[PDB]
Design a protein around this nucleic acid. Structure first.
Lengths: 149, 129, 141
RNA sequence: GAAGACGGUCGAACUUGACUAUCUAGAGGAAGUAAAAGUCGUAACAAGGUUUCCGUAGGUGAACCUGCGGAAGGAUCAUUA
RNA sequence: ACGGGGAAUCAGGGUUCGAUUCCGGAGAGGGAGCCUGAGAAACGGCUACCACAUCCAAGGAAGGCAGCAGGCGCGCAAAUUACCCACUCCCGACCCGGGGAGGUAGUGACGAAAAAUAACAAUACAGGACUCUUUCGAGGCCCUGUAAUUGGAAUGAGUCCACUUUAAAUCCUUUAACGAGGAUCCAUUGGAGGGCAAGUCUGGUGCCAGCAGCCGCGGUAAUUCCAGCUCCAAUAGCGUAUAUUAAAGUUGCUGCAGUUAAAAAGCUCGUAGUUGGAUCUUGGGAGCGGCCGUCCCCUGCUCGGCGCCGGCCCGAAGCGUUUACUUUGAAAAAAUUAGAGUGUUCAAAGCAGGCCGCCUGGAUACCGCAGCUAGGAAUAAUGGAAUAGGACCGCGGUUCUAUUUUGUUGGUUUUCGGAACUGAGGCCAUGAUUAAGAGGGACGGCCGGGGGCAUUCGUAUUGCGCCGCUAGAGGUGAAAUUCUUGGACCGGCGCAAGACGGACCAGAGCGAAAGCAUUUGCCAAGAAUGUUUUCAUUAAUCAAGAACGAAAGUCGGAGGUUCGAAGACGAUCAGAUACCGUCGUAGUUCCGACCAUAAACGAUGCCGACCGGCGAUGCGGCGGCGUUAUUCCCAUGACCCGCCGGGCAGCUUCCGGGAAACCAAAGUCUUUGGGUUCCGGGGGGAGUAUGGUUGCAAAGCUGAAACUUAAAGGAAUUGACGGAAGGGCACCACC
């Protein structure tokens, strides 16, 4: 069951049993990391990196090929973003909605969906403060939000 | 959401045996389910089972007789002294002649009758008869 | 119970505590309003002084005249219509007599045919109304 | 070394006013409940003779009536290329 | 409301009580202040004030029973103005005195224990064993029961000498004498319709009197009243009123309920609260009994004893992830409770007792929680290294520091111990469990009357103008009001305004709910599917707080086509402030601000798991003969046949449940425990009064009590009934 919907969807990605790398994949773990760096430098998220990789370069899971996963490869060298991509995207969506709702006070549905998105943010913020990957001093305020692109 | 995985298991193999199934898939898996089942097996209530290893939590497939009248969880896992264990088997089993409260002691997950002779109480997991 | 948490003692106790007030038998005993408005002030019996002898018309079905006695209670100064038991026992009650008065049986609820009379007369002038009815004691005058 | 006095201190009490917990008197008003047979009707139960009911308005001797939206607990589980 | 030890009840949980003899506290009419003393804020000490009250030669003096008696008062409610220090202890200078503390009697149906009110025979009698008889009857060797029948034998209630008892008595025990046939030395209390044991008896009354906890009885054969006889129940007791416990699974932790009986917030977000996925050690070594059973072992570094040529085996300290949990240990006043022993004559009790000077007891258990202790490490929480200030290693630098140290005594820095700051190397297999049929986020092509802003269209309606022809038109069950030769209604062309979005339109879709339907564009949003993308427990539900919230209604604008609360009429009618009709203001519409409610309904909280079958439909995806279109193949649409997920549904089934109606959920519930929120407790009074709070108002949210009541209610069955539907019959119906 979804967080802020009645939806009981089951559209999950389903990894195979065999964590063992396939045969055909000729790229060594280092050249995969080198290509991950090349994608990160272009300005892509670990989500967008992983998609571009498995599509055009036949690398199912970076964790399967290498040891580690894409953010931890970004983070080790310091190509990772300061605030997480998923909490970035909710703040990005909240600034989009709030801009729409500046000149559309009639749009009561928007206003309700804003409160649902605000709740997704506060909920993730609270999680990342327990894991100290955000400052304890940090708090998403909608007036301070437009600077956080 | 799913919170007591041992509840999902015992209710699913209870539902299944009431229906008359020869075996039943119980599609999350924990070490506590596996110890509980081995206790039900040692007293011959269920048949020799099978733990399917995916690389997540397992799935178990449990051969059934028609001996298991009911298995069940006690949630929450109440603490049971050796004093109190009479009052549980008094109100939670269908007789003194059969039925077994499983309770997780320090010694290990086991029936109430071994918790007597080992002289160790602990937390009631469930029961079966 | 609808919260079987191991750490839920106060919700379960504090709910039960709150929902006991929705019981009648509890709400009655555990407020002053039932014990204050009680004409006897929570006492079993009560001596009072007859100020008139009163015929009360029985209920809808059956139809006699129930011979009760209007009483000024001593302790409170409160007004009570109290029934007089067996056949021809209102003949034993001179006016301005100190009568000992009990409940009727239903813990301050109206009994049988008698509308809003919760009390019976037990003794009259400190002589028992059963003893007068059986003729064992004679009325001291 | 007694009385006694000044000052401090603890502080009962008293006067004055306000705040206030309970009990009691109350012209009049306005309810409710209980009666064996009061008056005007017939609102409701049968499509109860305008289907009933909900919310909200206004109105009227009275039950009530009417507007607007809703419900079936409807008097239709259906009405035909 | 003094607290506790405890009391009652009691399946297991509980509920109620504890003023009351033991512990601790407090106070001496209310407050206050203090003297003495080791100890007092003392009151059978003092000092004031307040209240009350005593004596008075009227100047003054004296008071504190919530000590023992006793009195008044208050009440439903509670005893003698007794004897005694002999017991128990206490005080004193004290073997010696004193103690209303305490003991002993008196009153005492609070309550508890034991336990008389007759037993036995002979007779009439009757029922049941047996030879015997069809039936009767015979016998009673065997029984058993009843008659104010008779007969002795009984023993204490009482009376009473004596002893014993005891401070002196009393009671008890012992014991002379008296002491029983209507054993008058006289058993009551409540009942006898049902619940509920026991009269359809007799006399009286006649819905009166009365009974009656409830249902009911009473109006002339009363099983219920008032009595008589009789019978029942408990019995020296039994009834009544009231609190309270069980019964009450009608407060529900064990363990209740919430579609319709009372009950799920209108809907969603949301913080504390509560609950929270899987995962991190196992194999064997040693030994016994007849392959299976029961045991010991699978952390490491300062001080000495089973020994040995600086250390090997082991003993005792001290550091050792932190908690819950379980088991053990210490410790925890008695009295009570359980309980061991023990003939108080039995018993309640008691703590004693037993043996021809001796022996023996005065045990033991339980004492939630919190605290202390030591094993176990399953379950649950918590932890450690991820810009490496990370281990385990040995090394080289720097600030301050025990002295064993120069034969005993003058100046030192050192090794050495020991602690900080810090530089490099090696070494670690060097450090990140998995990626939930949990969740978020990205991505992809879709999808939808989802929302907003704008744009656009369509008839129709009303009004207006023009043209035509004619007298009616509207309206109703029937009429009337209204319009109308100043041309209405009608027909044709236009114009204007404001509503509204037919048919397509579905048990179809979307939305949290309320809600959402002309075209087109913009705007952000969204579920579902697809995914070998990413984060990696981020979650579920939720007091506080919050968003949205039909219609009506309120305030200020704009507009006013239709419809139409109020109102004006016109009918119907007995009346008709209504249903019907013609006008018709507020309103209906738009904008800004309130209001926060609906049968806001699936009358059904949300999340999760599991348990039937079937064909449909909507969205996405995937696969498969064929037909058709873009024809020129493709690949996409449209059908076709399947599968998968998610959704709105439907049919069916003895899954199972339920009071049923019914429900694939309302099931997986006495075989009762997956998580969590709200909420119900017979009907009324009442969603009322009152207080708060929100609102301009209308009102909303929270919300009693007195009092009243034996039912109100749910589902289903049968009948009657209908101003419901259909079928059928009849010249007591019609044709």
């Amino acid at each position: 069951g979804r967080m802020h919907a009645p939806g009981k969807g089951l559209s999950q990605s389903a990894l195979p049993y065999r964590r063992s790398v396939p045969t055909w994949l000729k790229l060594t773990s280092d050249d995969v990391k080198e290509q991950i760096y090349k994608l990160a430098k272009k300005g892509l998220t670990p989500s967008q990196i992983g998609v571009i990789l498995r599509d055009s370069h036949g690398v199912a899971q970076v964790r399967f090929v290498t040891g580690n996963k894409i953010l931890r490869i970004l983070k080790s060298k310091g190509l990772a973003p300061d605030l997480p991509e998923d909490l970035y995207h909710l703040i990005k969506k909240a600034v989009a909605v709030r801009k729409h709702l500046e000149r559309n006070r009639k749009d009561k549905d928007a206003k309700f969906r804003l409160i649902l998105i605000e709740s997704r943010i506060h909920r993730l913020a609270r999680y990342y403060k327990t894991k100290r990957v955000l400052p304890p001093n940090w708090k998403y305020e909608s007036s301070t939000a437009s600077a956080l692109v | 959401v799913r919170m007591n995985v041992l509840a999902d298991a015992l209710k699913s193999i209870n539902n299944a045996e009431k229906r008359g199934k020869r075996q039943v898939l119980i599609r999350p898996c924990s070490k506590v389910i596996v110890r509980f089942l081995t206790v039900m097996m040692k007293h011959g209530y269920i048949g020799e089972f099978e733990i399917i290893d995916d690389h997540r939590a397992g799935k178990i497939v449990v051969n059934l007789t028609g001996r298991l009248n009911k298995c069940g969880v006690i949630s929450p896992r109440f603490d049971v002294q050796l004093k109190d264990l009479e009052k549980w088997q008094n109100n939670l089993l269908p007789s003194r002649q059969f039925g077994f409260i499983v309770l997780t002691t320090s010694a290990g997950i086991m029936d109430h009758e071994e918790a007597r002779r080992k002289h160790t109480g602990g937390k009631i997991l469930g029961f079966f008869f | 119970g609808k919260c079987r948490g191991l750490r839920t003692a106060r919700k379960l106790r504090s709910h039960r505590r709150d929902q006991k007030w929705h019981d009648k038998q509890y709400k009655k005993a555990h407020l002053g309003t039932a014990l204050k408005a009680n004409p006897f002030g929570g006492a079993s019996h009560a001596k009072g002084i007859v100020l008139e002898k009163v015929g009360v018309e029985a209920k809808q079905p059956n139809s006699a005249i129930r011979k009760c006695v209007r009483v000024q209670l001593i302790k409170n100064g409160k007004k009570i219509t109290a029934f007089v038991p067996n056949d021809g026992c209102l003949n034993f009650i001179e006016e301005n007599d100190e009568v000992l008065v009990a409940g009727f049986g239903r813990k301050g609820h109206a009994v049988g045919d008698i509308p809003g009379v919760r009390f019976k007369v037990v003794k009259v002038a400190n002589v028992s109304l059963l003893a007068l009815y059986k003729g064992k004691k004679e009325r001291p005058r």
